[PDB]
């Protein structure tokens, strides 16, 4: 019967919740009480990239920490050179409605997608020197919200159809499909080892997925509204979520609990992007307050603010070497903060 | 450097293509289309000419881009902000949906469901300034429907006869009462005319009014 399984199912949530309390020995805030603070983090706009004629939704750094990508509703995908602020490529999109970007780890490929329900992959290194579109991954039924390359052939995408998928670019078919989210999936983050990835959905939950098996290992709750951004800790043993509850939370994968909440009474708008520092000591979160805060990731004390944007800070990414932090916004400008 | 000097030449050559493309996109008119499944938005699109559907058509040297976003079937709360800065929001409601009901719900009218969608859109924080064109389709089918069936089935309170002229006029004014931004946005309501092809001309006149009124705002002559 439905009630047999339901009265059963609500019990299974109890042992999960019962065991999590038993493993809640002491709060990270108590353990990190005597750590010396990070001090005022004064970070200034070094470079400002101009050339977008609409609001920016997505940006992604390169693995060489110098090039980066950005997409906007103007239907242009631009590859920047952050050092010399000069445009390397300006890719016209078939669909002006683009909500995500990814720059391949090898830098041979770039991918974008949005309301057109397609993940388009553009080839950068092309004999005829004109970025050409390679493949169009059309297997989703809702807007694509995120996409992250594993290799030049594997890309994992999260869509508004409550499902994530792992693709094979050569064949253009979903190698694996991740199901179990009861709300629209907003963002995903890959583990450093590229064996696991966590996804945040509109159902106020984050799920840890396994890329090979295709089954969800753990599910984290605690937020009150949509989860809009997610990133792993550098060591791949923790991750942070940005929600519309104007709180960032640091979850652990081994302890399977929540550690911190980064909430401030002053802040009432929703978090749009989150990202870490190379050491994992700073958690940069791009709010709707038009500004971007920098949190002490082990003290939960707002040490630093990056207020330079007219409109909301849509995307926010840090370099692999951690020498810079770049924030996009709806004001059509990318700013490099160092 | 010799290499770096030639690099900056590209960046300027890129920027000049973006401006030329940006100034081409600025002249284009962006209309967002909404409504119920059976509204007649399909029939409106036919007169004018999965995922998000774009329709391009030209009228009197003006270029229109109509974004039929009916096929998204996901949470509007996450992607409706993408359409902030459209010239107008075309909205289609079928007048012949007053006595009907959705195949899923028991006795909640299709017309009352149209209002619930209209209330959330006209008062959406993203479309505080955006004008709404409101098409009311299937007007001749509504005339046949009202001549035999009463209008009390949908609106419990109604002072007026079963006459097309008065029956329709109540609905139009009933739809126009949903907006609280009365002095910020203008709703241009039209009854669909099949053969005349005036539906596209009404869009022309409604769009220019929103452009002309806006031009008077930013120059201060208003």
């Amino acid at each position: 019967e439905l009630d047999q399984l339901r009265q059963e199912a609500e019990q299974l949530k109890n042992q999960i919740r019962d065991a999590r309390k038993a493993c809640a020995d002491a709060t990270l805030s108590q353990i990190t009480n005597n750590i010396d603070p990070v001090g005022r983090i004064q970070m200034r706009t070094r470079r400002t990239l101009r050339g977008h004629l609409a609001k920016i939704y997505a940006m992604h750094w390169g693995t060489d920490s110098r090039l980066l990508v950005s997409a906007s509703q103007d239907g242009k995908l631009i590859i920047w050179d952050s050092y010399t602020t000069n445009k390397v490529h300006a890719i016209p999109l078939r669909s002006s409605w683009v909500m995500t970007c990814a720059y391949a780890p090898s830098g041979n490929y770039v991918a974008c997608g949005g309301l057109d329900n397609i993940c388009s992959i553009y080839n950068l290194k092309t004999r005829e020197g004109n970025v050409r579109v390679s493949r169009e991954l059309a297997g989703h039924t809702g807007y694509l919200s995120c996409c992250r390359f594993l290799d030049d052939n594997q890309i994992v995408t999260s869509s508004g159809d409550t499902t994530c998928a792992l693709w094979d670019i050569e064949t253009g078919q979903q190698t694996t499909t991740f199901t179990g989210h009861t709300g629209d999936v907003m963002s995903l983050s890959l583990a450093p080892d590229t064996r696991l990835f966590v996804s945040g959905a509109c159902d106020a939950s984050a799920k840890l997925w396994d890329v090979r098996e295709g089954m969800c290992r753990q599910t984290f709750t605690g937020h009150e509204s949509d989860i809009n951004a997610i990133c792993f800790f550098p060591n791949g043993n923790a991750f942070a979520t940005g929600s519309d509850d104007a709180t960032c939370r640091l979850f652990d994968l081994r302890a399977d609990q929540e550690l911190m909440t980064y909430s401030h009474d002053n802040i009432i708008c929703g978090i749009t992007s989150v990202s870490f520092s190379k050491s994992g000591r700073l958690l940069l979160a791009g709010y709707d307050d038009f500004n971007c805060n920098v949190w002490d990731a082990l003290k939960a004390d707002r040490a630093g603010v990056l207020a330079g944007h007219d409109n909301r800070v849509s995307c926010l990414g840090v370099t692999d070497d951690g020498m810079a932090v770049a924030t996009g916004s709806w004001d059509s400008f990318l700013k490099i903060w160092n | 450097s010799a290499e770096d000097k030639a690099a900056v030449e590209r960046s300027k050559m890129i920027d000049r293509n973006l401006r030329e493309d940006g100034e081409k996109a600025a002249r284009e008119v962006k209309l967002l289309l909404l409504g119920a499944g059976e509204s007649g938005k399909s029939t409106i699109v036919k007169q004018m000419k999965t995922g998000i559907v774009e329709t391009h058509f030209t009228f009197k040297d003006l270029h229109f881009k109509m974004f039929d976003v009916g096929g998204q079937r996901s949470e509007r709360k996450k992607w409706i902000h993408c359409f902030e800065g459209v010239t107008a929001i075309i909205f289609c409601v079928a007048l012949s949906d007053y006595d009907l009901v959705l195949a899923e719900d028991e006795e909640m009218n299709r017309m009352h469901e149209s209002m619930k969608l209209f209330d959330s859109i006209c008062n959406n924080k993203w479309f505080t300034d955006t004008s709404i064109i409101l098409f009311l389709n299937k007007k001749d089918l509504f005339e046949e429907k009202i001549k035999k069936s009463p209008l009390t089935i949908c609106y419990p309170e109604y002072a007026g006869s079963n006459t097309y002229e008065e029956a329709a006029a109540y609905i139009q004014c009933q739809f126009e009462d949903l907006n609280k931004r009365k002095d910020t946005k203008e709703i241009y309501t039209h009854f669909t005319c099949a053969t005349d092809t005036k539906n596209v001309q009404f869009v022309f006149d409604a769009v220019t009014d929103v452009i002309i009124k806006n031009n008077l705002k930013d120059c201060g002559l208003f």
Epitope: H89, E128 | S1, A2, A6, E9, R10, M13
Partner: single-chain antibody, 232 residues
Framework: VQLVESGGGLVQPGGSRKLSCSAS????????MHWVRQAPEKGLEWVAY????????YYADTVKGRFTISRDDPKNTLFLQMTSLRSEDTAMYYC??????????????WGQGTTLTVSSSDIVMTQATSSVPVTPGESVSISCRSS???????????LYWFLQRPGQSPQLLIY???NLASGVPDRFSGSGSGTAFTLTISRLEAEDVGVYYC?????????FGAGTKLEL
């Protein structure tokens, strides 16, 4: 992606002839083109250059004000207008394409060139090795020397390498020191700093025997080096 040029042949001195290079199979409108000439017995020598969209036109010392270079983007052609040819303009005129953006490979593709026989503050690159004997399966190193520190401020040593097999157009091997071109085996490698440069081949074959060239790109007019022919 082939490049073919038209013209050349036999011209009396003082005559004005035109060279047309019809690009086919690539985005010609976004490629900075060059011209490089090779004397019948001597090495390469840069002559001209046009940037993307005809924004920047440069020339060599021997052809300044004598040659006019133009491109026709819609027709995918490149033109060279030569005026009052001298006896020292007898050379095979290759056409080279190059694109400049972060991490690009300029001078990657070379035309077949045309034969032209007229009737009758500059960096100098020096390599004093010629007709060096070598056997297949051995390791050979080719050394180059510059008169100027090619290592720019940003750390880019704008030194290139080329390989011209007998009876073929020159082919890029190394577009900057410690970099490897596209479609060239891993055997070729180059390590150097400032004014000293080397090209190391681990194991070679009958296919890669020929003459090698060294070019700098720190500043115009892109002076080349003398040849370095591998003897086999």
């Amino acid at each position: 992606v082939q490049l073919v040029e038209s013209g050349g042949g036999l011209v009396q001195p003082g005559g004005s002839r035109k060279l047309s290079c019809s690009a086919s199979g690539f985005a010609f409108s976004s490629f900075g083109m060059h011209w490089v000439r090779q004397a019948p017995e001597k090495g390469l020598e840069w002559v001209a250059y046009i940037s993307s969209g005809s924004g920047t036109i440069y020339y060599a010392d021997t052809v300044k004000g004598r040659f006019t270079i133009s491109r026709d983007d819609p027709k995918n052609t490149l033109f060279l207008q030569m005026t009052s040819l001298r006896s020292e303009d007898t050379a095979m005129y290759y056409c080279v394409r190059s694109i400049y953006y972060y991490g690009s490979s300029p001078f990657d593709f070379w035309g077949q060139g045309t034969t032209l026989t007229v009737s009758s503050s500059d960096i100098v690159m020096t390599q004093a090795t010629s007709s060096v004997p070598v056997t297949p399966g051995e390791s050979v190193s080719i050394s180059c020397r510059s008169s100027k520190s090619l290592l720019h401020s940003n750390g880019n040593t704008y030194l290139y390498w080329f390989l011209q097999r007998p009876g073929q157009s020159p082919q890029l091997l190394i577009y900057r020191m410690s970099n490897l071109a596209s479609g060239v085996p891993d055997r070729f490698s180059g390590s150097g700093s400032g004014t000293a440069f080397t090209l190391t081949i681990s194991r070679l074959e009958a296919e890669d025997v020929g003459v090698y060239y060294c070019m700098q790109h720190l500043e115009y007019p892109l002076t080349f080096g003398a040849g370095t022919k591998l003897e086999l």
